[PDB]
Amino acid sequence: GQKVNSNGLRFGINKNWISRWTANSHAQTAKWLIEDEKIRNLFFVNYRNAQVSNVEIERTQATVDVFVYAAQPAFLIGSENKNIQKITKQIKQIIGRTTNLDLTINEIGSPMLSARIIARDLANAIEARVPLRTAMRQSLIKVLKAGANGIKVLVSGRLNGAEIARDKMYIEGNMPLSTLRADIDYALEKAQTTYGVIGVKVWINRGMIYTKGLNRTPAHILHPQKKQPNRQ
Amino acid sequence: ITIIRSPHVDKASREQFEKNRHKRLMILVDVNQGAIDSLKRIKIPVGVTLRFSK
Amino acid sequence: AKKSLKVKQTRIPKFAVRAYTRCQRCGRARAVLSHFGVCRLCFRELAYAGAIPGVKKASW
Amino acid sequence: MRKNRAPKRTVLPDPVFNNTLVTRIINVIMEDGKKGLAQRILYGAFDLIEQRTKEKPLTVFERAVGNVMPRLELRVRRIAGSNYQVPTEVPQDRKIALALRWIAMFARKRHEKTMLEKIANEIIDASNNTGAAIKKKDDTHKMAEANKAFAHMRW
RNA sequence: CUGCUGAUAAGGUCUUCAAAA
RNA sequence: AGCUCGAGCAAAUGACUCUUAAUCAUUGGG
RNA sequence: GGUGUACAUAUCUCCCUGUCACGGAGGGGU
RNA sequence: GUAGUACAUUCGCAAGAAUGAAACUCAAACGGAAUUGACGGGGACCCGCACAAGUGGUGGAGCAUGUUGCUUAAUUCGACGGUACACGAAAAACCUUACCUAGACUUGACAUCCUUGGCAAAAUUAUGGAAACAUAAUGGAGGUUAACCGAGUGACAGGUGGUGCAUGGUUGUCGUCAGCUCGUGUCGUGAGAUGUUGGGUUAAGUCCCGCAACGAGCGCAACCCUUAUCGUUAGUUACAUUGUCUAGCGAGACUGCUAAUGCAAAUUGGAGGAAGGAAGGGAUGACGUCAAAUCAUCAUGCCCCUUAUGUCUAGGGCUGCAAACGUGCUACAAUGGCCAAUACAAACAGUCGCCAGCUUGUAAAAGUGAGCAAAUCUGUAAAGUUGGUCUCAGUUCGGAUUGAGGGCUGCAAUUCGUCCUCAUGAAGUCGGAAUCACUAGUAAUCGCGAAUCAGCUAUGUCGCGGUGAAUACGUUCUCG
RNA sequence: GGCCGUAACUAUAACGGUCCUAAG
Ligand SMILES: [Mg+2]
Ligand SMILES: [Mg+2]
Ligand SMILES: [Mg+2]
Ligand SMILES: [Mg+2]
Ligand SMILES: [Mg+2]
Ligand SMILES: [Mg+2]
Ligand SMILES: [Mg+2]
Ligand SMILES: [Mg+2]
Ligand SMILES: [Mg+2]
Ligand SMILES: [Mg+2]
Ligand SMILES: [Mg+2]
Ligand SMILES: [Mg+2]
Ligand SMILES: [Mg+2]
Ligand SMILES: [Mg+2]
Ligand SMILES: [Mg+2]
Ligand SMILES: [Mg+2]
Ligand SMILES: [Mg+2]
Ligand SMILES: [Mg+2]
Ligand SMILES: [Mg+2]
Ligand SMILES: [Mg+2]
Ligand SMILES: [Mg+2]
Ligand SMILES: [Mg+2]
Ligand SMILES: [Mg+2]
Ligand SMILES: [Mg+2]
Ligand SMILES: [Mg+2]
Ligand SMILES: [Mg+2]
Ligand SMILES: [Mg+2]
Ligand SMILES: [Mg+2]
Ligand SMILES: [Mg+2]
Ligand SMILES: [Mg+2]
Ligand SMILES: [Mg+2]
Ligand SMILES: [Mg+2]
Ligand SMILES: [Mg+2]
Ligand SMILES: [Mg+2]
Ligand SMILES: [Mg+2]
Ligand SMILES: [Mg+2]
Ligand SMILES: [Mg+2]
Ligand SMILES: [Zn+2]
């Protein structure tokens, strides 16, 4: 049957919030809730070739701070910091010139075990007419070789352009979805194929969190150094 | 906040969400500049909200 | 007809009671949360994505 | 297909006459969850019994319930057409419960004035083996005696 | 422990493929 | 009226369903 | 009486059942 | 299949027996054996408010709301057994709105790409106006065009238009039931089987023994929240009858000890304990079935419209009405009606708001007007207790319907808001065949709060507390 | 012995309802 969202079930217990701010009134709460959505959607739908794993937003009465974790931040940086100013102006237009922007790019360590970029690669391969069995097999084998626990990939839709929708699942390793202690990262993406839309959902297991607390700690960004700038 | 799960029908199947505004109080008798200047450099995290009343 | 209705909602009317609250992300008119300015079906998505700070699932 | 026997909650002794049956009949005449109203009804009826019979109300009440209290129960068991009944001996607890239930049901139907006097007169009438609960007990007893033949087969 | 207990319009998806990694 | 004595069939249009049948209404047609 | 002589059949409503029939409750028509 | 039929022949008193085709038609056959499921008015075992034992209802009346049908210019569309019908819709007078009538518009109400300038868009006042829109005004923030304000300009924008049987996402249901599989190995020519069946124990494919199986994954359980006892931290805006209360951390309950029997899991009883053997409740819902629901939250393949199926506005409509069904409220009453005094909550909410007090009014409310951005101020607790009166009647029950006078919101209350007062006083006296919910603070019953909301016969939805029951012998029957 | 209705071109009625008789 239907299952609750893996991220939503674990939020507020073993996962911190992607946007951390306290608005003044109900009128401002909607504007701030929509502007952050616009910024995140921008960073995800465009500038996709940089493998942006996640973007967090942190706002005060008047100051906006953006933390963009990316696997290949060279594409965000551009040639001698060219596209950086373009995305800065895009964000400033999105929120407002009256505020102070503190954009900060962060190179994410051990990218392979991140469901967002795994799903994005899956969707890109699907859209590029790559055969599905080979695509999922190579993604699963590279994810496992990255040194993580089980990964479950569900790819549904008009499969290979067929007129009857199917679904194909590959679980390889233990994926306890009912357990709350487990560190399960879940992402979902849409491959826009010439025959319609394909939905790819990737669950990845990254061990068990044996330290009680609302995170306040990096999650698989720490194995190598996670120090990139563009801030003040 | 109670929200119906389904997109179209089945109002019976509905989930719930909560938001808690945890609140603490702390009153200082006499501070003076010697304490105020040190208090200036605290950098309270964004989630925390101050309601200083003088 | 949805784009015209969204634009008309943003535009101020000539009477005060003419004004209604639509969702800001989507354009749904009914079942809009004035606390968040977002309809129920987008509030669920934002809460499951972690966009709204402090909105955790309730156990009572 | 349950294979579990239900527990039993305490009956509690009455805090006036120290007779559990008083509390039981209070709970039986309970309606809308009004313990105060039920207790008032019972104690007013007992005071009317004092005023009329000139005897101990607890003794009169016991004499009424013991006389109304049945012996046999007829359990419906259908096989092909209609139902052939089965006489079975009842436990003492269910015996008392049925007696109290019949007393209350036939008390809340009599033609008289306030339910105080209604139940009081029903109790005094059942104390002398002439009443409506008496007729009910007589009817079930006669039906069981008629259908004594099928007592051997129960299920 | 043998009461009674009858019927359900037509045609239809759904496996594309292992060549292989 | 196309047929049997405005009626009922026949025909058509839609509703209905994955599509039909059946059904539902409407309907021209002396 | 709509059909055979107030009756039955038939008609309508509600139960029954996945649905229909059967079955059960009620109503009306010379 | 025709068909053991027809003709001819032999036997027989007769029924008939023996012998026995073809024309025509199909791609297979009431073919054989075996396998996996489903089903059985076939057995064995086990579960669930399923049956049983009780409580209170529904079907009968009036009203609210939804639906079917019919009507209409439209009565927008969707949901249709369980799993639709107080459902989408957590607010239809205008807007919403997608429908009808009518008045107006065309790279358009909104957007990008291009050649191009910015020395505007608003808002409001005049006249025409049902308003859209037109002719004139203050010609406007700003920052030289940043955003936006334009001209030219063709790609195009736009669609709540069709297809949920082309899809993504989300959801109902079996079902919180205990199942669904895989790797290696073995058996079989093969589908396939084993493990997963067998014996004990559980809510459990939970665990332990046995065993051609050895292991593993999802599901189960635990980890998460809350209620029940206590310690510590802190004492204002709580308490201030001094240790309640609020919220961080922690202790506590682990079949931990004991007796019985079992190989072992484990089952039952006792002790201490606030709590005992999943302590109560919640979140948590496997593979898949129903081509289940949604193109009308959103996104999207394909088809269709492109001076119209796109856009603005005014009016009407979604509120109709011989009827039928579902879900609820109110009752048919002395366990009560009315009047007076009066005690005891929790949770939540509040600066276009909560509104204390006072004055006015029969009352809805009006005016004045403090307090509160809130453990501080505000949002009257009712059932309950006592007293008075009614005295079993279609009534001092019941309030529908109807006429009149007012209050509030709002440009605007006729279609179509709700409240108060006065007046009228339908049905209904326990509801046929047949059905629903519920196993303790549960059913029943009484109030309070919030969401959407200018306002709303929400009697609906989501929450909180006060009083507070009856029954479970058992699986013969009934559904799953 | 009668009467009435009834099959997806028409036609008919395998079938159904009912009155009477000793039986049609
Ligand atoms: Mg749209
Ligand atoms: Mg409104
Ligand atoms: Mg029978
Ligand atoms: Mg037949
Ligand atoms: Mg269709
Ligand atoms: Mg032969
Ligand atoms: Mg044959
Ligand atoms: Mg079955
Ligand atoms: Mg059976
Ligand atoms: Mg029962
Ligand atoms: Mg009721
Ligand atoms: Mg009714
Ligand atoms: Mg549609
Ligand atoms: Mg409709
Ligand atoms: Mg449909
Ligand atoms: Mg309208
Ligand atoms: Mg200027
Ligand atoms: Mg210039
Ligand atoms: Mg479907
Ligand atoms: Mg099995
Ligand atoms: Mg075996
Ligand atoms: Mg075994
Ligand atoms: Mg669990
Ligand atoms: Mg369908
Ligand atoms: Mg459904
Ligand atoms: Mg569309
Ligand atoms: Mg209009
Ligand atoms: Mg409606
Ligand atoms: Mg009284
Ligand atoms: Mg005070
Ligand atoms: Mg007051
Ligand atoms: Mg009293
Ligand atoms: Mg009457
Ligand atoms: Mg009255
Ligand atoms: Mg009116
Ligand atoms: Mg009466
Ligand atoms: Mg139970
Ligand atoms: Zn929305």
Short mmCIF file of C-alpha atoms in Angstrom, two decimals, chain A residues 4-5 7-8 11-12 17-21 26 29-30 33-34 36-37 40, chain C residues 24-25 34-38 46-57:
data_model
loop_
_atom_site.label_atom_id
_atom_site.label_comp_id
_atom_site.label_asym_id
_atom_site.label_seq_id
_atom_site.Cartn_x
_atom_site.Cartn_y
_atom_site.Cartn_z
CA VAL A 4 4.75 7.71 4.50
CA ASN A 5 7.58 9.86 3.17
CA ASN A 7 12.22 12.10 4.98
CA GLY A 8 8.99 13.44 6.48
CA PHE A 11 12.16 15.12 10.23
CA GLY A 12 12.32 16.74 13.65
CA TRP A 17 15.18 21.49 8.84
CA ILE A 18 16.40 22.69 5.45
CA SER A 19 15.18 26.25 6.17
CA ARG A 20 15.77 27.76 9.61
CA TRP A 21 14.09 31.11 10.28
CA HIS A 26 1.59 35.44 9.06
CA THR A 29 5.63 33.71 6.78
CA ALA A 30 4.12 32.98 3.35
CA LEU A 33 8.22 30.27 2.60
CA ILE A 34 7.76 30.89 -1.13
CA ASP A 36 13.11 29.88 -0.33
CA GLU A 37 11.18 27.43 -2.51
CA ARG A 40 15.92 25.93 -4.11
CA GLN C 24 1.11 31.20 -3.32
CA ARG C 25 2.93 28.14 -4.69
CA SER C 34 -3.68 31.68 6.22
CA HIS C 35 -0.96 30.93 8.78
CA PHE C 36 1.28 29.72 5.94
CA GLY C 37 -0.40 31.07 2.79
CA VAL C 38 -0.16 27.58 1.29
CA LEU C 46 6.80 21.38 2.04
CA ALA C 47 6.52 19.71 5.45
CA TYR C 48 7.76 16.39 4.03
CA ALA C 49 10.65 18.25 2.37
CA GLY C 50 11.55 20.13 5.56
CA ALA C 51 10.92 23.59 4.13
CA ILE C 52 8.69 24.85 6.97
CA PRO C 53 10.81 25.10 10.16
CA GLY C 54 9.37 23.46 13.25
CA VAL C 55 6.59 21.56 11.45
CA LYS C 56 7.14 17.99 12.63
CA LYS C 57 4.68 15.11 12.54
#
